[PDB]
Amino acid sequence: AKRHRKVLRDNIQGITKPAIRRLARRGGVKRISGLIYEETRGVLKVFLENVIRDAVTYTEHAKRKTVTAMDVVYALKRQGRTLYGFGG
Amino acid sequence: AKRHRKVLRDNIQGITKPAIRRLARRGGVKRISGLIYEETRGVLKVFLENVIRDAVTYTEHAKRKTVTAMDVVYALKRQGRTLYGFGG
Amino acid sequence: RKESYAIYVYKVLKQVHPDTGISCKAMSIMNSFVNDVFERIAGEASRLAHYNKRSTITSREIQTAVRLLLPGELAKHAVSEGTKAVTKYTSA
Amino acid sequence: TRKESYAIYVYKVLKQVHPDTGISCKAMSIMNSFVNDVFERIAGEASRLAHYNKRSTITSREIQTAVRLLLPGELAKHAVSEGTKAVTKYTSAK
Amino acid sequence: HRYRPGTVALREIRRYQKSTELLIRKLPFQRLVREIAQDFKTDLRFQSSAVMALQEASEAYLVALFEDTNLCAIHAKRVTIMPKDIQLARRIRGERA
Amino acid sequence: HRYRPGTVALREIRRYQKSTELLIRKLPFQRLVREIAQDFKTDLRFQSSAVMALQEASEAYLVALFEDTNLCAIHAKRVTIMPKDIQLARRIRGERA
Amino acid sequence: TRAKAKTRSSRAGLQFPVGRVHRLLRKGNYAERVGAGAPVYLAAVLEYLTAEILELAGNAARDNKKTRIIPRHLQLAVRNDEELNKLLGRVTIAQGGVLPNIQSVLLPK
Amino acid sequence: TRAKAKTRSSRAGLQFPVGRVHRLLRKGNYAERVGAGAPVYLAAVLEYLTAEILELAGNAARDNKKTRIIPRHLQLAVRNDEELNKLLGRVTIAQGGVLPNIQSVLLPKK
Numbered sequence: 216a217k218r219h220r221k222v223l224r225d226n227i228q229g230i231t232k233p234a235i236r237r238l239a240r241r242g243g244v245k246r247i248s249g250l251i252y253e254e255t256r257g258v259l260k261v262f263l264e265n266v267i268r269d270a271v272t273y274t275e276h277a278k279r280k281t282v283t284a285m286d287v288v289y290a291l292k293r294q295g296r297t298l299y300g301f302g303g
Numbered sequence: 304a305k306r307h308r309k310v311l312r313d314n315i316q317g318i319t320k321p322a323i324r325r326l327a328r329r330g331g332v333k334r335i336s337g338l339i340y341e342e343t344r345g346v347l348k349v350f351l352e353n354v355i356r357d358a359v360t361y362t363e364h365a366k367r368k369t370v371t372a373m374d375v376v377y378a379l380k381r382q383g384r385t386l387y388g389f390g391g
Numbered sequence: 392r393k394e395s396y397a398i399y400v401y402k403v404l405k406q407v408h409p410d411t412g413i414s415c416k417a418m419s420i421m422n423s424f425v426n427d428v429f430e431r432i433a434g435e436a437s438r439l440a441h442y443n444k445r446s447t448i449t450s451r452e453i454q455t456a457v458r459l460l461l462p463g464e465l466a467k468h469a470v471s472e473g474t475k476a477v478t479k480y481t482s483a
Numbered sequence: 484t485r486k487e488s489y490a491i492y493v494y495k496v497l498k499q500v501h502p503d504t505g506i507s508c509k510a511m512s513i514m515n516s517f518v519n520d521v522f523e524r525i526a527g528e529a530s531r532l533a534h535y536n537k538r539s540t541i542t543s544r545e546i547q548t549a550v551r552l553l554l555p556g557e558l559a560k561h562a563v564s565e566g567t568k569a570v571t572k573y574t575s576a577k
Numbered sequence: 578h579r580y581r582p583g584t585v586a587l588r589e590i591r592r593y594q595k596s597t598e599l600l601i602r603k604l605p606f607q608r609l610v611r612e613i614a615q616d617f618k619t620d621l622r623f624q625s626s627a628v629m630a631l632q633e634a635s636e637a638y639l640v641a642l643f644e645d646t647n648l649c650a651i652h653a654k655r656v657t658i659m660p661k662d663i664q665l666a667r668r669i670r671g672e673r674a
Numbered sequence: 675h676r677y678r679p680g681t682v683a684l685r686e687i688r689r690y691q692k693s694t695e696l697l698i699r700k701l702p703f704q705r706l707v708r709e710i711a712q713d714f715k716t717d718l719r720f721q722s723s724a725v726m727a728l729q730e731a732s733e734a735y736l737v738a739l740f741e742d743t744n745l746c747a748i749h750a751k752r753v754t755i756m757p758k759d760i761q762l763a764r765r766i767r768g769e770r771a
Numbered sequence: 772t773r774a775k776a777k778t779r780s781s782r783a784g785l786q787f788p789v790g791r792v793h794r795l796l797r798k799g800n801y802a803e804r805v806g807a808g809a810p811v812y813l814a815a816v817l818e819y820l821t822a823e824i825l826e827l828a829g830n831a832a833r834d835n836k837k838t839r840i841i842p843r844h845l846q847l848a849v850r851n852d853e854e855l856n857k858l859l860g861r862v863t864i865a866q867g868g869v870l871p872n873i874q875s876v877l878l879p880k
Numbered sequence: 881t882r883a884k885a886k887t888r889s890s891r892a893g894l895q896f897p898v899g900r901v902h903r904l905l906r907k908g909n910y911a912e913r914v915g916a917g918a919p920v921y922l923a924a925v926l927e928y929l930t931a932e933i934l935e936l937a938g939n940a941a942r943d944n945k946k947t948r949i950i951p952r953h954l955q956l957a958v959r960n961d962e963e964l965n966k967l968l969g970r971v972t973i974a975q976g977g978v979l980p981n982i983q984s985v986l987l988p989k990k
Contacts, residue, residue, distance in 0.1 A: 226709050229702025237697040238733075239755065240690040241978060242740025244747075245683045245986045246754035254757040255736065258764070262735055263710050266728065269459060271714045276455040277443055282711070284723035289442060291731055291972070293435075293459065298734075300509055300951065300974030301727045302516040303488055314612050317605030325600040326636070327658070328593040329869060330643025332650075333586045333877045334657035342660040343639065346667070350638055351613050354631065357552060359617045364548040365536055370614070372626035377535060379634055379863070381528075381552065386637075388416055388842065388865030389630045390423040391395055402786050403821050404840075408829035412839040417828075420845055420864055424824070425817055427862070429795070432813060437801035437909060448796065449806035453813050461816075465823075465854045469816045476783040476815035477808035483782035492896050496930050497949075499895070501938035505948040510937075513951055513973055517933070518926055520971070522904070525922060530800060530910035541905065542915035546922050554925075558932075558963045562925045569892045569924040570917040576891040577916075583879065590873055597843050597868035633865045640869060645766045651876050652762050653750050665749050669742050669766040674969065680988065687982060694952050694977035730974045737978060748985050771860065800909055 227256050266290050315344050354378050396425050432456045450477050489518050525549045543570055599632055606632055642666060696729055703729055739763060779811065787814040787821075827852055842866040888920065896923040896930075936961055951975040 235255050239247055267282075269290035274282050284301045291298050323343050327335055355370075357378035362370050372389045379386050400421045404413055413421075435456035436448050445452075454473070458466050493514045497506055506514075528549035529541050538545075547566070551559050593600070607628050614621045643658070645666035650658045667673045690697070704725050711718045740755070742763035747755045764770045779789035793810040827848035828840045835844065846867030849855045888898035902919040936957035937949045944953065955976030958964045 222709075223705065224709065226702060226705040229706055230698060231702070234698050237686075237690055238736050239740045239744075240683070240686040241697060242737045242744060243687055243691065243982055243986075244740050244744045244755050245680060245687065248754050248756050250757050251755060251760070254760050258739065258760065259732060259736060260710065263707065263728070263732065266731065267707065267711050268714055270724070271711065271718070272455060272458050273442075275715075276439055276451065280717060281719040281721060282724050283721050284727050285442070287724045287727045287731075289438075291727075295970055296731060296735070296972060297520065297970065298727060298731055298972040298974060299513040299516040299520075300730075301512070301723060302519060303512055310612075311608065312612065314605060314608040317609055318601060319605070322601050325589075325593055326639050327643045327647075328586070328589040329600060330640045330647060331590055331594065331873055331877070332643050332647045332658050333583060333590065336657050336659050338660050339658060339663070342663050346642065346663065347635060347639060348613065351610065351631070351635065354634060355610065355614050356617055358627070359614065359621070360548060360551050361535075363618075364532055364544065368620060369622040369624065370627050371624050372630050373535075375627045375630045375634075377531075379630070383861050384634060384638070384863060385427065385861065386630060386634055386863040386865060387420040387423040387427075388633075389419070389626060390426060391393075391419055396787075399787050399818075400821055400825070403818060404825045404829070406786070407822050407826040410838065411829045411832060414839055414841050416842050416866060417840045417845055420842055421821065421824070424859075425821060428820060429792070429813070429817060432816065433796060433799055433801050436809075440802050441909070446802055447804035447806055448802045448809050450808040450812045453809050453816070457816055461820075462857055463854055465820075465858070469819050472819045473812040473815040476785055476811045480779060480783040480789075480808065480811045489896075492927075493930055493934070495895050496927060497934045497938070500931050500935040503947065504938045504941060507948055507950055509975060510949050510951050510954055513954055514930065514933075517968075517971075518930060521929060522901070522922065522926060525925065526905060526908055526910050529918075533911050534800070539911060540913035540915055541911045541918050543917040543921045546918050546925070550925055554929075555966055556963055558929075558967065562928050565928040566921040566924040569894060570920050573888070573892040573917065573920045577888070587873070587877065587879070590877075591871070594869055594871045594873075597846075597866050630865070634863065637863045644869075647874065648762065648765065649749065651874055652746065652758065656877060661749065665745065666766055668745060669763055671767075671969065684982070684986065684988070687986075688980070691978055691980045694955075694975050727974070731972065734972045741978075744983065748983055753986060768860065800911060802909060 227260055230256055230259060265294070266296075269293060315348055318344055318347060353382070354384075357381060396422050400425070431460055435460055450474075489515050493518070524553055528553055599636060601632065601636070603628075603632075606635075645670070696733060698729065698733070700725075700729075703732075742767070780814065783811045783815065785811070785814050785818055787818045789814050792817075824848060824855065827855075843868055889923065892920045892924065894920070894923050894927055896927045898923050901926075933957060933964065936964075952977055 232252055235252050236247060238255075239251075266287065267290075270282055270286045273286040273289050274280075277286075288298055288301050320340055323340050324335060326343075327339075354375065355378075358370055358374045361374040361377050362368075365374075376386055376389050397418060400418065401413070404411065432453060433456075436452035439452045439455055440446070440448050450473075454470060457469050457473070461469055490511060493511065494506070497504065525546060526549075529545035532545045532548055533539070533541050543566075547563060550562050550566070554562055607623075610628055610631055611621070611623065614623070642663065646658045646662045649662035649665045650656065653662070664673060704720075707725055707728055708718070708720065711720070739760065743755045743759045746759035746762050747753065750759070761770060780786065783789055789810045792814045793805060796805045796810060796813075824845065825840075828844045831844040831847045831851075832838065832840050837844070842864055843866070846864045847870070849859055849864065850870050889895065892898055898919045901923045902914060905914045905919060905922075933954065934949075937953045940953040940956045940960075941947065941949050946953070951973055952975070955973045956979070958968055958973065959979050
């Protein structure tokens with residue numbers, strides 16, 4: 216059976232275990248428990264869906280289908296997570 | 304010797320031990336260590352001097368000597384601690 | 392003559408609870424809430440007009456401001472309730 | 484398309500403080516975003532200060548109070564000094 | 578008849594979370610506000626509603642701080658709050674950062 | 675020649691805190707952003723700089739979260755971070771509140 | 772033939788003042804032009820939010836055997852509703868108190 | 881007798897553009913009137929903040945044996961200065977990284 220779907224759904228597992236370990240090494244974490252990665256994936260999904268929902272709202276105010284970087288900058292700016300290096 | 308000064312300086316000790324205990328009882332704290340009260344007094348002093356400094360700046364923009372309640376409301380509003388019941 | 396939102400919040404209360412009163416401190420809290428929400432939505436709509444190089448504020452900016460500021464399902468019912476009023480006024 | 488930025492002014496300020504140090508494009512965009520963000524914060528605070536005092540104009544007093552409110556501590560008092568002297572020179576001249 | 582240590586604290590927890598009165602006396606708070614205000618400038622007058630608004634702001638801030646402090650103490654397998662719990666709460670909030 | 679457990683982790687801590695590259699691969703992050711975006715509406719196009727800005731936002735948010743998580747774990751007399759440390763930090767920040 | 776000066780709030784079927792919201796938008800330094808339907812829409816949104824909080828506060832006063840809404844009822848109504856709790860999570864209500872909540876570790880045996 | 885069109889920034893002894901700050905204040909929907917000294921004062925404040933961060937970033941590039949300021953130098957300059965750290969504590973700098981900081985519990989034994 217060669218049947219499979221075109222749309223992939225396990226891309227939250229695309230944030231791999233050594234990526235989360237590198238993130239914690241940048242955060243200064245020495246030892247990591249085995250249950251950390253699923254919680255980190257859920258937290259990343261929640262944060263990403265919040266920012267992307269605001270960016271999509273900013274895009275469809277402008278009657279556009281393309282999410283620009285400035286919409287992401289405004290979406291991060293409204294929640295108090297202002298980002299430099301893309302505003303201009 | 305009946306000599307004493309008019310200005311009192313130990314008013315940070317005017318926030319008494321049972322007042323801090325009542326505050327922690329409202330916060331849902333069962334047991335309180337003995338070193339809690341000095342830390343709470345320092346935290347209250349830092350928060351109060353931040354809010355009062357902003358309120359004094361708001362007052363002297365208006366060329367006034369009296370700190371109104373609306374200046375305190377604006378000072379709390381700028382730091383993201385907006386208070387209801389005095390704005391009007 | 393000191394401006395407030397007293398009688399409008401009072402008639403809204405009589406709509407939702409015809410036999411329930413309200414106190415002065417609660418009325419001041421409701422007035423501060425209405426002023427705060429109006430300020431937030433108007434500032435967000437002004438920013439939306441500024442980012443799109445638009446010099447006017449229409450119902451679309453206020454709708455996007457409600458969808459941005461009000462979270463979740465509260466937004467979609469509020470968006471529903473408002474579109475209706477603009478519709479009535481326009482027919483009216 | 485003439486795209487507005489604060490490029491040459493930040494560059495000449497850099498040449499004032501460090502005559503032999505360059506800068507990259509990403510750092511320049513970060514500096515531009517910083518200048519725009521600080522200008523937006525100070526202008527919004529001054530607009531709120533004018534609105535609370537029932538004043539329809541924005542003068543140097545509103546910007547001074549906005550600097551004293553937003554910029555924290557000693558950074559405020561030197562910034563207030565630097566601005567205040569400049570207004571004095573500009574009055575001497577215009 | 579003596580009480581077990583902890584049920585009186587639970588009674589005060591259930592009592593003070595129901596009522597909404599100010600838990601700090603008015604006059605020491607007014608004296609503290611005036612002492613804190615007088616170093617920025619001398620000759621400051623205060624409205625009563627301004628000191629009251631400062632009082633409820635201090636109430637809400639300190640009650641929220643003790644909730645975060647209690648959560649830190651429970652996370653450290655303790656029922657007694659300590660200053661290390663307070664400095665953790667304020668750090669994670671960004672106040673000490 | 676085997677290494678003691680912990681000095682390699684300290685070497686990666688000292689290494690990854692010096693460099694500033696993105697620690698998440700580009701293509702899985704683009705796929706995750708597109709999957710998260712496609713439920714709000716279908717047919718969404720993405721600029722490369724938008725996904726990059728989302729990437730550095732996720733980097734900064736998650737690194738700050740692991741710093742708060744490490745502080746929670748150290749406060750609980752541990753050197754290993756746990757999901758209870760993560761949920762404790764988010765609450766004191768207000769995300770779970 | 773100036774027919775009886777029909778108000779905009781009665782035309783929009785709202786109780787909140789449309790013309791006053793229009794005046795506050797024009798004088799609020801947001802944009803130099805304000806559309807016609809924007810104050811109608813904003814007044815309807817403000818009316819809906821006020822109605823939702825007032826209904827929950829009336830329910831909270833009814834469960835506490837009160838016929839008059841106090842700030843404690845408003846605080847209970849805001850904090851017990853999670854969407855209003857994350858709308859006004861950065862908002863202090865004076866004379867409101869806190870939710871009665873005891874952690875389960877502190878409960879006795 | 882239109883004498884040589886003397887600019888406001890050169891009159892104020894500033895490098896940041898006074899007239900451009902005036903145009904952005906007039907078109908920024910803040911107030912319908914803008915005073916004369918307000919763009920001068922705001923341009924001087926922006927120039928001072930830019931000069932302070934650029935001086936610390938140049939020092940950070942000098943200590944890292946670099947002649948070109950990268951975002952890492954800006955991040956180090958902002959985070960190592962506590963007044964700038966609490967001015968931009970809610971601000972993300974892209975490609976900036978973090979301060980090198982290891983908690984003393986995690987250090988080994990000796």
